[PDB]
């Protein structure tokens, strides 16, 4: 079976400008399309299960743990859940002038985290293949690398493919990321027809991603730089405590603080 | 002793590739071959190692007029009690004699990892907050808003190997070979020439190996390009230039650290 | 009775096997040998050769020698250690004991032989809680009046479970109980 | 490490004591107060001299005139060196206890 | 406590007669290179910058398996080739330790030069005297952890704790995962140790530039074909098919960012949350860590954070993420 989780990246700074600017585009039709990727990724099988994971600056919370329209009743409570719970969560908010960008890696930890839970709970009989449908619409933070690095590292480790589908902006952390783990990077520049890549690049699993033609992937500038500057650096000289790439021999590198002995 | 000479031989055909670059080396004449290398049963020996009476013996009845079948014949051959007991012990202890031969880290700066290498007004906040809270009071609109059929039409259009988003020779085999050779030989003398370039090395004897392997990459160098010059005319498709940056490069390298020694002087 | 074991198993081939596991030293009664062979002994034990020192429970080196942490790890005793019953003095000594303060004949060389067992086999423990194993090679251990006999703290530790071990069940114990003495406090 | 032994206070040098030393010293001075010969028996060869060897001296400055003097005797002249080997480490202990030299006199023969 | 990134680890394996006897529930020999796979494989994924060697002694002589390399899937060929070994003869602990020493000793100061010998056979029969090369080993700073099996073998006991390494004996197969899974971690540096600056290389994947014009073809660097692009180096300008790798000509590392990234967990271990099983006035149901009902009377919680853990999230967060998901916020 398939276990997909759909982290959505509902920064309200952004898609707020968005609503200011009365584009085609909004968070509403974002969060239709995934809802209907979702009722499709089930539709698939019956063992398949999905889940969806909603980001804000603050932190980030998970959309998804009759037939009154003659519709099937377990898509009908995804409908429903969701669409409730995603209106609570935006319409409900903290304002926090300091902090503004948009939350990815904490929401990325605990989406591995659950797909290692749900992992533990299945029957060892029937295997899992779990994925992670990123879903980026903001600039990434600075700050944030350390760890979400650790989060890319963790889930190459537990085999997990973070598919990315940034939009609007190329962030190269999270391209970066899902190189590492083999997956799938698609950077659409038509919003309106987000779906049709949805149903098309993405949803197809790791099972028959191989045997399909797919977008080739983008090149990936694993750029280094030292801590003085941030500037690309093509030499770097770390010691053997801190692990950090630094600009030029130094008698001592600040992060250190070693009794470095020349030679 | 002609140690040289025996460790030639044994090498001559055992390795091919060893050879076979240090062969081509001199196939050209390109320098000598001197600095080539100057740079660069069981029970027997048990007995022979165990019984010191063996060797002595070993050494004055050394095969004359006589057979090794023999001589293994002659290895097996209360008082005769005590022997036993007393061999034990010495032969024991002749064994043993012969396998005996004569920080708390602490940091000042962080940060500097949460953002590591990767590289790089208040009212908008509060008006952008807003309407997208105001956004999302209507829901379902799934029946027709979400996709229309143009847009899809071109999403598919653009899918397509000449659309947007979606870009979509083994012909020589013999050369292959040729130009793996020729890059087994630039990696051996590329080895010595940079295995003391990146350091400083301000020291005489130092840098007058370095002196004489810059002039080795002139004398190398010089019948690299009349190889390339053969493969070059045959049918100028599927060109080799990256055997060109490599030289280029470490010429690159010996000028400017050149220049940079002169400057330093 | 050692220069016929040993004899034995070396026209066998268990005393090959035995060398080439590990080093082998006997004792004589000559006090220059035994010094030299335990000389020996203790450097084989420093090093990973190991060493097998055959000995006499009686002999001289049995009571001077004492065997600490990696000395002596798994003492072997190959019978019951009694004189022979043809020594002309033990006949005095021991009748006469039997004659005054009523000791029995077998009772006192019962005794005369666990004493020295216990002598012999209780080096292992000398200090610092080193571990260690004391196989006795014997069923006559195994009787009730043996064991009584035998020294308390030796005797309490014993139980019924590994009282009569046959050899492969004895060799399996002794490779698990080293197993746990391997690992720290 | 001083030991509130049934009888008095015991010096000891080593930090702490298995049960059995309890015991050991227990029944050691039960036999030293009945003034009567006796034997016992102790399984470990070494830490049994130190007990001992303590029990006896402060047995003697509880009692000096109980007992004259101590005569201990071993097997061999090898192992009876390791017993002042202990006898010595003891009394630097106690030596530094009290901060000052006492009339205390150790010898071999 | 310092901690030494990079690290040049020996694994000594023993082909001894005594690795015949079965043991483990499979041959031993099998099982010790079954699981070392996983161990070669784990260690690689824990300290890309590091490099590993195997040297199996059998017969009285040692001979280097694999020499040193930054490839996982090599050493893993070598190991499953290892499998079919006849495993006859006696180990000679001189004779290997002297060839992971000669091959150590012109290594760089900065690294930290390891050794792990599996020692299954207690013998040690040796040509010379080992106590004079354990004085060699600690002039050389060359740490040496013995992980002997049914057997505490007192000269490997005073290797350990004089060289500075650790000394252990299996208990089973499920004790022999933890103990080489242990080992996998970087070992705190001591006095001894010393911290040096090392040169570092960061190459760019590079592909044809502009429809295959003024293309780079080239076929590797250690049957490869011929390769439009991949990955080169700054000073070499030699193709190389996989990263991280040691320049063949340079003698400089080339890794990339990600894989230095791939250790700043170390530097930043997580601290141990406090186990309290009662709920403690914990209303929540739902875990944060996996949102769901906490159907077991144990939590977890941060000193900073204060979230709430189920069993299953604390161990995986300090198992493998290395990092407390809710207090990243
Ligand atoms: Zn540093
Ligand atoms: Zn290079
Ligand atoms: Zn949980
Ligand atoms: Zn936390």
Redesign the interface.
């Known amino acids: 079976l398939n276990l997909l989780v759909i982290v959505v990246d509902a920064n309200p700074i952004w898609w707020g400008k968005q609503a200011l600017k009365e584009s085609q585009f909004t968070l509403s039709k974002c969060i239709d399309a995934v809802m209907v990727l979702g009722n499709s990724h089930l539709f698939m099988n019956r063992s398949n299960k999905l889940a969806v994971i909603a980001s804000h600056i603050q932190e980030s919370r998970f959309l998804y743990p009759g037939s009154k329209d003659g519709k099937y009743e377990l898509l009908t409570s995804a409908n429903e859940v969701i669409v409730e719970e995603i209106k609570d969560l935006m319409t409900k908010s903290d304002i926090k002038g300091q902090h503004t960008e948009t939350l990815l890696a904490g929401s990325l930890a605990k989406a591995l985290c659950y797909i290692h839970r749900m992992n533990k709970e299945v029957k060892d009989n029937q295997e899992m293949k779990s994925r992670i449908l990123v879903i980026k619409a903001a600039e990434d933070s600075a700050l944030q690398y350390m760890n979400f690095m650790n989060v890319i590292f963790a889930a190459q480790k537990q085999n997990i493919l973070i598919d990315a589908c940034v939009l609007d902006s190329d962030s190269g952390l999270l391209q970066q990321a899902c190189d590492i783990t083999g997956g799938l990077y698609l950077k659409v520049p038509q919003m309106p027809s987000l779906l049709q890549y949805l149903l098309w690049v993405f949803l197809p699993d790791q099972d028959q991603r191989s045997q399909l033609i797919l977008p080739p992937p983008v090149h990936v500038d694993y750029r280094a730089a030292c801590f003085c500057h941030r500037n690309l650096i093509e030499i770097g000289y770390v010691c053997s405590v801190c692990l950090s790439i630094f600009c030029n021999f130094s008698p001592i590198c600040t992060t250190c603080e070693t009794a470095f002995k020349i030679s | 002793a002609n140690k040289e000479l025996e460790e030639k031989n044994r090498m001559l055909q055992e390795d091919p590739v060893l050879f076979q670059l240090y062969k081509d080396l001199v196939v050209s004449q390109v320098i000598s071959a001197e600095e080539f290398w100057a740079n660069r049963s069981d029970i027997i020996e048990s007995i022979f190692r165990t019984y010191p009476a063996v060797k002595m013996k070993y050494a004055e009845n050394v095969p004359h007029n006589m057979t090794e079948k023999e001589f293994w014949t002659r290895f097996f051959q209360e008082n005769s009690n005590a022997a036993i007991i007393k061999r034990f012990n010495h032969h024991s202890a002749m064994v043993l004699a012969a396998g005996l031969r004569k920080i708390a880290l602490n940091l000042k700066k962080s940060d500097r990892y949460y953002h590591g290498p990767t590289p790089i007004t208040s009212q908008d906040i509060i008006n952008s907050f807003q309407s997208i809270r105001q956004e999302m009071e209507a829901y379902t609109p799934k029946l027709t808003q979400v996709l229309s059929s143009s847009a899809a039409s071109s999403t598919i259009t653009a899918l397509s190997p000449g659309g947007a988003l979606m870009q979509g020779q083994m012909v020589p085999n013999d050369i292959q070979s040729e130009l793996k050779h020729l890059y087994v030989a630039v990696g051996e003398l590329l080895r010595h020439f940079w295995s003391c370039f990146p350091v400083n090395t301000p020291f005489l004897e130092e840098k007058v190996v370095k002196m004489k392997s810059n002039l080795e990459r002139f004398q190398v160098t010089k019948l690299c390009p009349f190889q390339e010059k053969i493969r070059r005319q045959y049918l100028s498709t599927n060109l080799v230039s990256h055997i060109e940056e490599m030289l280029q490069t470490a010429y690159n390298k010996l000028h400017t650290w050149q220049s940079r020694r002169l400057m330093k002087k | 009775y050692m220069e016929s074991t040993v004899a034995s198993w070396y026209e066998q081939g268990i005393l090959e096997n035995i060398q080439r596991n590990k080093l082998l030293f006997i004792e004589t009664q000559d006090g220059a040998e035994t010094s030299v062979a335990l000389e020996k002994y203790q450097e084989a034990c420093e090093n990973g050769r190991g060493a097998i020192l055959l000995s006499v429970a009686r002999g001289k080196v049995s009571e001077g020698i004492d065997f600490v942490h990696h000395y002596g790890r798994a003492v072997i005793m190959f019978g019951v250690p009694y004189v022979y019953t043809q020594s002309r003095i033990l006949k005095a000594r021991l009748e006469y004991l039997r004659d005054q303060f009523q000791i029995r004949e077998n009772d006192f060389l019962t005794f005369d032989a666990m004493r020295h067992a216990a002598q012999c086999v209780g080096r292992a423990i000398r200090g610092k809680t080193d571990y260690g194993l004391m196989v006795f090679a014997d069923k006559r251990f195994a009787r009730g009046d043996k064991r009584g006999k035998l020294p308390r703290w030796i005797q309490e530790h014993l139980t019924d479970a590994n009282l009569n071990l046959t050899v492969d069940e004895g060799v399996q114990v002794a490779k698990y109980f080293l197993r746990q003495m391997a690992q720290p406090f | 490490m001083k030991l509130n032994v049934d009888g008095l206070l015991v010096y000891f040098p080593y930090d702490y004591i298995y049960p059995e030393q309890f015991s050991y010293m227990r029944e050691l001075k039960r036999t030293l107060d009945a003034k009567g010969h006796g034997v016992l028996?102790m399984?470990?060869?070494?830490?049994k001299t130190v007990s001992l060897l303590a029990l006896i001296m402060a047995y003697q400055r509880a009692y000096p005139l109980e007992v004259t003097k101590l005569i201990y005797c071993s097997?061999?002249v090898?192992?009876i060196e390791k017993v002042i080997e202990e006898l010595r480490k003891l009394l630097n202990f106690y030596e530094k206890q009290e901060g000052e030299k006492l009339p205390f006199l150790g010898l071999a023969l | 406590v310092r901690l030494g990134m990079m690290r040049h680890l020996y694994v000594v394996v023993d082909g001894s007669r005594t690795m015949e006897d079965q043991d483990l529930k499979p041959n031993r020999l099998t099982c010790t290179l079954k699981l070392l796979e996983y161990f070669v494989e784990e260690y690689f994924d824990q300290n890309p910058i590091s490099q590993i060697g195997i040297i199996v002694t059998k017969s009285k002589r040692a001979e280097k398996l694999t020499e040193l390399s930054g490839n996982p899937r090599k050493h893993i060929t070598s190991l499953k080739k290892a499998v079919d070994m006849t495993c006859h003869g006696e180990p000679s602990l001189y004779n290997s330790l002297s060839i992971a020493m000669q091959t150590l000793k012109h290594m760089p100061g900065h690294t930290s030069r390891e050794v792990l010998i599996i020692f299954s056979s207690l013998t040690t029969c040796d040509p010379s005297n080992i106590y004079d090369l354990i004085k060699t080993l600690k002039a050389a700073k060359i740490r040496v952890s013995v992980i002997g099996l049914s057997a505490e073998v007192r000269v490997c006991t005073v290797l350990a704790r004089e060289t500075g390494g650790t000394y252990h004996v299996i208990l089973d197969e499920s004790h022999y995962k933890e103990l080489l899974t242990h080992h996998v971690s970087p070992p705190p540096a001591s006095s001894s140790s010393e911290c040096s600056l090392i040169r570092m290389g960061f190459p760019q994947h590079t592909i044809a530039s502009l429809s295959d014009q003024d293309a780079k073809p080239s076929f590797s660097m250690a049957e490869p074909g011929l390769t439009l692009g991949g990955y080169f180096c700054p000073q070499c300008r030699a193709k190389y098919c996989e990263l991280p790798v040691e320049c063949k000509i340079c003698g400089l590392t080339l890794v990339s960012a990600p894989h230095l990234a791939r250790s700043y967990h170390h530097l930043f271990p997580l601290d141990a949350f406090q186990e309290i099983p009662l709920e403690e006035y914990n209303g929540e149901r739902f875990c944060y860590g996996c949102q769901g009902e906490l159907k077991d009377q144990h939590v977890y919680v941060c000193a900073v954070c204060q979230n709430v853990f189920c069993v299953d999230c604390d161990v995986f967060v300090h198992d493998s993420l290395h990092c407390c998901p809710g207090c990243i916020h």
């Open positions: 028996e399984p470990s060869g070494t830490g097997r061999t090898p192992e």
